[PDB]
Amino acid sequence: LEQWNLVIGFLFLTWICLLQFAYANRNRFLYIIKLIFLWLLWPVTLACFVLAAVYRINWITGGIAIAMACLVGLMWLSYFIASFRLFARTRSMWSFNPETNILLNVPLHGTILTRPLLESELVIGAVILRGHLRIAGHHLGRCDIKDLPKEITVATSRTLSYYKLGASQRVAGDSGFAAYSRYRIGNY
Amino acid sequence: LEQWNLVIGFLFLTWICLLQFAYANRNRFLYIIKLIFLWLLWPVTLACFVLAAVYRINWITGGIAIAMACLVGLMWLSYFIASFRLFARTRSMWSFNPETNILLNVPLHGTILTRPLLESELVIGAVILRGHLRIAGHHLGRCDIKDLPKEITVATSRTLSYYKLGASQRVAGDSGFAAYSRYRIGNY
């Protein structure tokens, strides 16, 4: 049974190792690895509760573990049905993340890049670092001040909020810094 | 031995429960709870490796677990000595966090609020949401457009970077949005 303990040790060790390089340098491969890695936390939690409930000798702790496993499974299925409700409308793979059900669509370089967004703030920042665009902690790619998006969107079940570009601030040679004020909330 | 399994189940359940309320509404109490909660991940990882190594029957897996426990302990002590090197200069409690060793000092309402900062970007955003100031995901407090800081600092072992306020953008009634361009890097 120590194999599962060594597996959780490997998981914890690599997750700790994730907190020295990937937190600063944001790569799409590393981000999606971290995302699917957080998505697998729910089944391993359920597995821990299951292996706690299999060896039931007394009924108090076993009943507590069974009730909590039922609750966490119910809320996991609630999250699954929420992600299904989102994906039935926005039709985006990033709607199946365990982080949030709030989507950010940015039309950069023609392709619509979709990223998870924390809370859909009324004003959304856009920061240019050495010609690289980042919005809400997501490095969308290499976009200098000339090709900045004009209008982006925030997608949600029965909600689409349009965000219009504000003023652009050219400073420190090539770095730029701009705001997205909320325009309107619709569902056509 | 199932008590430790139920403890890790409680930890995972409450950490999953943390991903529905505290991620959107940022409270200082909830943030510091999450911070000390991430700080206790290192000893529980070491404990998992220790309980994997105590029941050594074969030598291959036991040796692998012992070597990995030694490596994770060595890097944990490296992190401890890094935090000590930081705290010997900046003298701030927030230097003892497992997230980052990059400090952000903001002079808001007279008191110098210090927060962890991800990577010390050359341009730092400041967003006003309903009269509340947030910088790099940290809700520093209630600060409208009038009392915005003039100059903030980023603290680091043998580094202090001064950040000067840029242009201020008043939009949507009371919301504001401003930039901190890097001024100079010193250590006096």
Numbering used by the authors:
A (entry chain B), B (entry chain A): 17 to 204
Paper passage:
SARS-CoV-2 encodes four structural proteins incorporated into virions, spike (S), envelope (E), nucleocapsid (N), and membrane (M). M plays an essential role in viral assembly by organizing other structural proteins through physical interactions and directing them to sites of viral budding. As the most abundant protein in the viral envelope and a target of patient antibodies, M is a compelling target for vaccines and therapeutics. M forms a 50 kDa homodimer that is structurally related to the SARS-CoV-2 ORF3a viroporin, suggesting a shared ancestral origin.
We reconstituted homodimeric SARS-CoV-2 M in nanodiscs made from the scaffold protein MSP1E3D1 and lipids (DOPE:POPC:POPS in a 2:1:1 ratio) and determined its structure by cryo-EM. The majority of M (189 of 222 amino acids per subunit) was de novo modeled in the cryo-EM map. Each subunit contains an extracellular or lumenal N-terminus, three transmembrane helices (amino acids 17–36, 43–71, and 79–105) connected by short linkers, and a β-strand rich C-terminal cytosolic domain. The inner sheets from each protomer interact through a large (~690 Å2 buried surface area per chain) and complementary interface with residues L138, V139, V143, L145, F193, A195 contributing to a hydrophobic core surrounded by additional polar interactions. Second, the M pocket is completely sealed by protein to the surrounding membrane and cytoplasm; no openings large enough for water passage are observed connecting the pocket and protein exterior. In M, the gap between subunits is confined to the region between cytosolic domains because transmembrane helices from opposing subunits form tight interactions across the entire lipid bilayer.
